[PDB]
Design a protein around this ligand. Sequence first.
Ligand SMILES: Cc1cc(C(F)(C(F)(F)F)C(F)(F)F)ccc1NC(=O)c1cccc(I)c1C(=O)NC(C)(C)CS(C)(=O)=O
Ligand SMILES: Cc1cc(C(F)(C(F)(F)F)C(F)(F)F)ccc1NC(=O)c1cccc(I)c1C(=O)NC(C)(C)CS(C)(=O)=O
Ligand SMILES: Nc1ncnc2c1ncn2[C@@H]1O[C@H](COP(=O)(O)OP(=O)(O)OP(=O)(O)O)[C@@H](O)[C@H]1O
Ligand SMILES: Nc1ncnc2c1ncn2[C@@H]1O[C@H](COP(=O)(O)OP(=O)(O)OP(=O)(O)O)[C@@H](O)[C@H]1O
Ligand SMILES: Cn1c(=O)c2c(ncn2C)n(C)c1=O
Ligand SMILES: [Ca+2]
Ligand SMILES: [Zn+2]
Ligand SMILES: [Zn+2]
Lengths: 727, 146, 48, 49
Amino acid sequence: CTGNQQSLAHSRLWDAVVGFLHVFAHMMMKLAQDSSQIELLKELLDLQKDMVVMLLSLLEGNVVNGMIARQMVDMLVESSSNVEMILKFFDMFLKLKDIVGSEAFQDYVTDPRGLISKKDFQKAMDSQKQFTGPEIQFLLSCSEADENEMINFEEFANRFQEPARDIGFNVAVLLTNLSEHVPHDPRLRNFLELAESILEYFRPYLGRIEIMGASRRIERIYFEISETNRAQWEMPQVKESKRQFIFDVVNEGGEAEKMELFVSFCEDTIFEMQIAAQISEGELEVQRVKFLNYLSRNFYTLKYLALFLAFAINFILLFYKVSDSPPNMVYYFLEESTGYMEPALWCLSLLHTLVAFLIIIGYNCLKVPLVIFKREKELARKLEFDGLYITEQPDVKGQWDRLVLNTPSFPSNYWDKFVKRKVLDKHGDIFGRERIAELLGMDLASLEITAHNERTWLMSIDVKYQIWKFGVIFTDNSFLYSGWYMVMSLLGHYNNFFFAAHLLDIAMGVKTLRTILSSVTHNGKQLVMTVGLLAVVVYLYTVVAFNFFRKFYNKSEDEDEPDMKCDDMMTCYLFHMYVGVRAGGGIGDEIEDPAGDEYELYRVVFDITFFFFVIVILLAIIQGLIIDAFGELRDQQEQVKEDMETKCFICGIGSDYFDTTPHGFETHTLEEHNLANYMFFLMYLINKDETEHTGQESYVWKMYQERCWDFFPAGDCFRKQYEDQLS
Amino acid sequence: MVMSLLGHYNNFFFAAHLLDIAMGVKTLRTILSSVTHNGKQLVMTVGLLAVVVYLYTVVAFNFFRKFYNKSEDEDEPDMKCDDMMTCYLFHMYVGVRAGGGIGDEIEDPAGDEYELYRVVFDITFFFFVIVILLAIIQGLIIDAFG
Amino acid sequence: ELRDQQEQVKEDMETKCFICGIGSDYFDTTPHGFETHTLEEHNLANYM
Amino acid sequence: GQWDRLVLNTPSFPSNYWDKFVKRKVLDKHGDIFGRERIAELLGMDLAS
Ligand SMILES: Cc1cc(C(F)(C(F)(F)F)C(F)(F)F)ccc1NC(=O)c1cccc(I)c1C(=O)NC(C)(C)CS(C)(=O)=O
Ligand SMILES: Cc1cc(C(F)(C(F)(F)F)C(F)(F)F)ccc1NC(=O)c1cccc(I)c1C(=O)NC(C)(C)CS(C)(=O)=O
Ligand SMILES: Nc1ncnc2c1ncn2[C@@H]1O[C@H](COP(=O)(O)OP(=O)(O)OP(=O)(O)O)[C@@H](O)[C@H]1O
Ligand SMILES: Nc1ncnc2c1ncn2[C@@H]1O[C@H](COP(=O)(O)OP(=O)(O)OP(=O)(O)O)[C@@H](O)[C@H]1O
Ligand SMILES: Cn1c(=O)c2c(ncn2C)n(C)c1=O
Ligand SMILES: [Ca+2]
Ligand SMILES: [Zn+2]
Ligand SMILES: [Zn+2]
């Protein structure tokens, strides 16, 4: 609201702030000289944290060159000599941790207790040339004396770091906000170099983002990112979902759902991260949980020991021979005279059947939730928004899903556990409350009569919900492939040739191969037709042979024994389709010459036409289709890599508009619109309270809690509105 | 230099310098870099050929050993498909080069015993290998040239 | 080629208006801009 | 890189790269931050002398 931000811009509020600036720079530098003064100083840092966030919330709704920004900067330079004293206090107490991490001063202490001598550590700071002369006696006075041989550099590093943590980040926000807001202020240029160390210690934990709300203006929004949110973001199990999410959105997804899939992806990744935090490192439950944690943690590598074994049980098997007298036919092993192979074969079989099971359990305990999360989310959301069932009517998927609504735990992974009430209330009467409570199993009256508002897993394991979950998982594809790998492994103990069907998983995983495997199924609906066309053409050329050319079809040399393959038309047709399309010269290559004048010319056309139509055209098209489907699937993976280096993926502005300066597009992508920044912003919003969301924060949040996507830039990024007014 | 020097050992080595015409002559040097341009995705295709011919060797070693008698002599039986390490080499040697698939080099399935199954074995070995993969490869090669 | 003539159609019908020769970019400066434009401004069904 | 980490001690590291004073430059610019004497030992400069 401007009407308050105008009145605050015209009082003596700056002159109030200047007095608060002068008391802050002098209270700390007096209070930093005792251990028994530290209780007071933590309160002071939390106070000026709340002061500068008032300055930030005063500087929201800010234009690039506005007088509020200009009254902010001269007030900082009317309060110069103290505001560097607070800046140098942040600057000295941050390099103190980075200096003491060097081994040059751990070598300067020879005490095994760690109690470094004061004058010894005094010349240590005098050895490095970054601090000043008065700084070390300021630091020696900050240190404890303890018979002048003990400063205890370890506790001295982190003592004044954790209470000074958020405020040192927060002051860097305001400095980098205003410097990004107004250009050409050399006092700010004096300020930014004076506070360089607090920038780089608080640049990775910072994140920038740019949203456009509040009557068509984009503005830089800033936030904190924890160490924990960046730790479980740079995991490959999270990253593999992203690389797929990059693919199927820019390839087949339109510009509309791009953002809707993005926040859905932001929902799903946030999920996997919760369940990865769940598994991060009488007692039957405890032992089993340790077992599961061990499994899932190794899960990525337990697949490699399954691949090895399987490539070994083969090199062994590749040594079978057959004979009558078993040293009827008795399959046995060559016995190459190495370590007894049979024994090792049995051992590896066992293993390959165990290390499969423990590949199934891992999948069940890792990738299941994120699927029974994707289903629950999508369902509930297409329920309380589109009113799928109560108003409209369904898709085998939908019919199957119309089974858990009665369940007492419908939202079992979808965080929102109140999606029951919402739908009822929003269609309360329109479709009959009691009817809706019956459909959803809420128990209406008693439900709302729940005392909550007013005032042994096997033991109670709901059956019906388990049935729904198993149905949906068995409907999954990747679980079916792991079920097939288990079933083949198990069946292998029946006959080791089945340990030659795991041998085959090298293929379905090895990238360049997996493409060649999807080629067939990519357009089978238009390759099966071609095969069928081959079947019908060979049919038509079989019928004529069965009406006029039966005479020639005698593939038996024996004078007496006549074969006459072309008598039972079901036999002639198979003869053609078996040795016809494989002759390479057509059918006429496998029958007697037409030298006989009888129908000689007609057969001379039958041969040539069968060859040309089939073995030159169709046995070509097919190959054609195949090779092609292999080429296109090698381009869909190309266009992505192309455009991700050409478009911003948030706004549809190419790289040319950001090529009018070095690293223009690069910098734009790297800080203006890193989508990682957006996904972090979503987590930061979800984490903090509601009573603390600032204006723009609460605004974007409340436009998210009802699924409106008008707060993404999509058309201009802070260099099309203010391009002229900023250099 | 090493080939030239070794040539004095046996003049056929003066047929390895003969080959430098190639590595310098532009239009050729391209054809030579084609193979190494994407070998990481052509070696995989070869390997896929190896594995498919393997899978079609195993079935022949479990049900079709009977047919694999490439020796005409009445007495002397060859039976190439007895030592699986022998049957697999027989396939990978005269299989992918038949141009009509493996079924072009064995006795006819006229015998009703497993006649239909062999009529599918032949056609599938031909289609999957000699029409698809021995095509892709050529494909990869020609492309890398384009 | 006969598999591309059927491609270009599906491409451009999602790129041009078919009544005015204005692409989808000019109607991309707002959500569903091109979509709304096609759906009410120029549904040729409306003309017929 | 590992192989290149062999000539830094050599008395003639910049043998074709015209700049033959690239020894001093690096020392001076990281003079203390990483220990002069340590850097002179790494680069075979013989610091003081
Ligand atoms: C380890 C491995 C390496 C290679 C390499 F080719 C590559 F280059 F790709 F890495 C090689 F390293 F060998 F060179 C190929 C496949 C595997 N196999 C598995 O990961 C594995 C093992 C057992 C059970 C299952 I399930 C799997 C497994 O995850 N399979 C699939 C096919 C990837 C599962 S899916 C159908 O994609 O969901
Ligand atoms: C003279 C010549 C002509 C032709 C013509 F084909 C062309 F049209 F290209 F000019 C021809 F004139 F014959 F038509 C082709 C190759 C040569 N060979 C050499 O230059 C030669 C000789 C000996 C040792 C070496 I080393 C070379 C030589 O430089 N080789 C390479 C292969 C170019 C060296 S590299 C691997 O490229 O570094
Ligand atoms: N808004 C964006 N516009 C264009 N490209 C983007 C955008 N956001 C991220 N990227 C892309 O993300 C990539 C970041 O580099 P990086 O290699 O780390 O990611 P990756 O190639 O997908 O694989 P990974 O990060 O897992 O190693 C860059 O290619 C960068 O272009
Ligand atoms: N003026 C127009 N510009 C671009 N596209 C148009 C225009 N008018 C109609 N269309 C196209 O007509 C299609 C309407 O969707 P719809 O699927 O119903 O038609 P269809 O795909 O041709 O087949 P059918 O309507 O018979 O089911 C949209 O793809 C829409 O882009
Ligand atoms: C896991 N999770 C989310 O993913 C989420 C949320 N609110 C919004 N989202 C996206 N809550 C409360 C939540 O617990
Ligand atoms: Ca508030
Ligand atoms: Zn952008
Ligand atoms: Zn129009």
